[PDB]
Design a protein around this ligand. Structure first.
Ligand SMILES: [Cl-]
Ligand SMILES: [Cl-]
Ligand SMILES: [Cl-]
Ligand SMILES: [Cl-]
Ligand SMILES: [K+]
Ligand SMILES: [K+]
Ligand SMILES: [K+]
Ligand SMILES: [K+]
Ligand SMILES: [K+]
Lengths: 222, 207, 215, 212
């Protein structure tokens, strides 16, 4: 398929710089303008600029002019966006997006990269401690019980939670993280299951916090 | 240079409804308006380009029309997965977004409680979790009872976005306690009041 | 089946105007720029300008500002180039071409339309022999002179003579008329015993001439 | 404008051998370069784009390289179909520009032209014009000069010239020059000469005829 895969989430101290990557596959990278659009958490979309991967020309929003740099490596079909002198209001999800339109004035931004969360902060990266959430044991013999994983004390966002390596998708709820007074995040991934499978089937959650390269395949059992 | 406005800011409709939202441009932009859809946690998706052209691969219930300054975007039959924020855009300028929610029948929460794990007690913290699963409407109250004593100031909550399949909400409350405080008591309970319940529901554990 | 269908050769008088069509099919006419390219005497590629049908915008080569005018008709999927105030130096082949990808280059081209600007009307040729000189190999030929427009077809002995034949490209005289040569080398022994007739045909004037070349 | 310079209007090569055509840009164009092939009477065909990528349908014999200003298209194992003209093109900025073209041609052993002069036809003279034709037959390379002389006096601006394409079998070239005079001017002079200069000729050759 036509897709754009971006580098992982990162934390950067104020005043530092960040470089986000974007690898294009399924189409001739050199043939289409590449755009970057960021989104501060909860807010809207803000356009930063574009690059012509063929000629190497660029065009930046005047808001970012003297502070952003866009480049590309055609030998590996990768685009890059570097933002310097980072401040707290630069914390945002940074998106890759190709302009699939051949008109001189239309922009048809399709497809979009998955996004890179860049967190601007002086705090250090910390992996999560993953704890189990065991069924109440009471339950209803002919019903459904709940079990989950507690992903606690990590920084920066995000963590990704899977269950049984993606085999278990129904009834899964990974809640939004919550910021504790300590500056660390915490969330919960739960799943509802039939009370019969509690004694037979084994459920293991698959937490992954890439900013610290932490991976915990925790098994949940009463 | 170009100011984009959208209306309504938010809306709640029912599965099957014909939903239309609007976008206005500070100046005449002919039919150069595009509409992007953004589901919580995902990237925007192009759905309509040049005001009325449906992007390949997008369902046919999505449409668009308008030329000049005023435009509309339409969902001929709202589907449960159509919950999202919809942004109009022309060139570099994005509209503020319209959020579409779904109104649904009432659904009572499946309440669950989890005591702290033994591993976490080694650390000196006690996290008691309480889960309200797939309910509607979104409003819900959670009161913690540490030992028949109504707790406060030591609970953090988190709610999920409307489910793409059944349009329900799930909530997760966490009571965080000093392990020194967690051992001195034994009757820990999570009381849940929701419209879908005839009476408040309480799930407890011991130890 | 991406195609760019252009019109056939066009003739026009100095001072006049022409509007050359380029009919596009097989692709989304609005999602790709179209350009026009001039080429005189099979020689160089000169960029005239580009038009984007969806936007309607146009970008011209400064040298063709005021001479060329590009338009695009979304209804017929046809691009047009209008050449104004025609002169001799506008005689050329004009190509149509479609952009490969948004960042440039051109993957599909029209076949080209040959435009001629001249103050002359159809005129048949006069074929004069080029007789061999007074063993070895001898040279003979025919001179096809003062005709218009192009082209002319020259064969020798109704096609029975091809080895050694050389039909040269036509030249444009100051009179606005074309002049061409066709020659063949043959053994000197053949002169006298073998007869040599150049066969000239000028379809634009329904002129069919056979000329016997004799020593 | 950005000038795309192909320094060689023509290049000599041989079947099976390796040839590289050059293009230099007057300004940095990154990799925004394409290469087109064109045969007589046909439209340009795209072969290489973005400097080194092959257009769909192009055999591996065609490779492209360069970034910045110096660009090259290389044909390994030249075939007959490849004997054509090649244009570079930048798409860095407007105005879009092409190179002048380099025609691939076959090399072969030098061959001097066989010269022939032809007097004006009596049938033509009966009409008021007089055309004297000189012919350089089957020569290589194709660089050759023809000087017309009337009564040992040089002529200039009074003749037109025309050359054929490289012969399929001989790999040679032919040229036809026509001196056009009036019946009055032709009947007033005596000797008419065609002087031919060619690499394969030690000294310029002359073919003449006395009017009569
Ligand atoms: Cl550049
Ligand atoms: Cl700050
Ligand atoms: Cl998309
Ligand atoms: Cl969910
Ligand atoms: K770059
Ligand atoms: K575009
Ligand atoms: K506009
Ligand atoms: K206890
Ligand atoms: K060579």
């Amino acid at each position: 398929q036509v897709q754009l895969v971006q580098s992982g989430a990162e934390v950067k101290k104020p005043g530092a710089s960040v470089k986000v990557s974007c690898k294009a596959s399924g189409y001739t990278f050199t043939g289409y303008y590449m755009h970057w659009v960021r989104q501060a958490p909860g807010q809207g979309l803000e356009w930063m600029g574009w690059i012509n991967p063929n000629s190497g020309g660029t065009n930046y929003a005047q808001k970012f002019q003297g502070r952003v740099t866009m480049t590309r490596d055609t030998s590996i079909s990768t685009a890059y966006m570097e933002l310097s002198r980072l401040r707290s209001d630069d914390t945002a999800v940074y998106y890759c997006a190709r302009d699939g339109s051949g008109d001189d004035t239309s922009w048809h931004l399709h497809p979009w990269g998955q996004g890179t969360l860049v967190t601007v902060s002086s705090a250090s990266t910390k992996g999560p401690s993953v704890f189990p959430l065991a069924p109440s044991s009471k339950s209803t013999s002919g019903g459904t019980a709940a079990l989950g994983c507690l992903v606690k004390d990590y920084f920066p966002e995000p963590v990704t939670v899977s269950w049984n390596s993606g085999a278990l998708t129904s009834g899964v709820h990974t809640f939004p993280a919550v910021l504790q007074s300590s500056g660390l995040y915490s969330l919960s991934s739960v799943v509802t299951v039939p009370s019969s499978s509690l004694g037979t089937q084994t459920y293991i959650c698959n937490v992954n916090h890439k900013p610290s390269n932490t991976k915990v395949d925790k098994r949940v059992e009463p | 240079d170009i100011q984009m406005t959208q209306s309504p800011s938010s809306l709640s409709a029912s599965v099957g409804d014909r939903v239309t939202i609007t976008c206005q441009a500070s100046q005449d932009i002919s039919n150069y308006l595009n509409w992007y859809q953004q589901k919580p946690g995902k990237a925007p998706k192009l759905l309509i380009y040049d005001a009325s052209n449906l992007e390949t691969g997008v369902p046919s219930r999505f449409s668009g029309s308008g030329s000049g300054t005023d435009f509309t975007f339409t969902i001929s039959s709202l589907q449960p997965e159509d919950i999202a924020t919809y942004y109009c855009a022309v060139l570099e300028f994005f509209g503020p977004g319209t959020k579409v929610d779904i109104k649904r029948t009432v659904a009572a929460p499946s309440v669950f409680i989890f005591p702290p794990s033994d591993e976490q007690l080694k650390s000196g913290t006690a996290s008691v979790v309480c889960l309200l699963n797939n309910f509607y409407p979104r409003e819900a109250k959670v009161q913690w009872k540490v030992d028949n004593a109504l707790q406060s100031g030591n609970s953090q909550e988190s709610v999920t976005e409307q489910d793409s399949k059944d349009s329900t909400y799930s909530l997760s409350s966490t009571l965080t306690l000093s392990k020194a405080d967690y051992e001195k008591h034994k009757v820990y309970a999570c009381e849940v009041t929701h419209q879908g319940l005839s009476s408040p529901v309480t799930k407890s554990f011991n130890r």
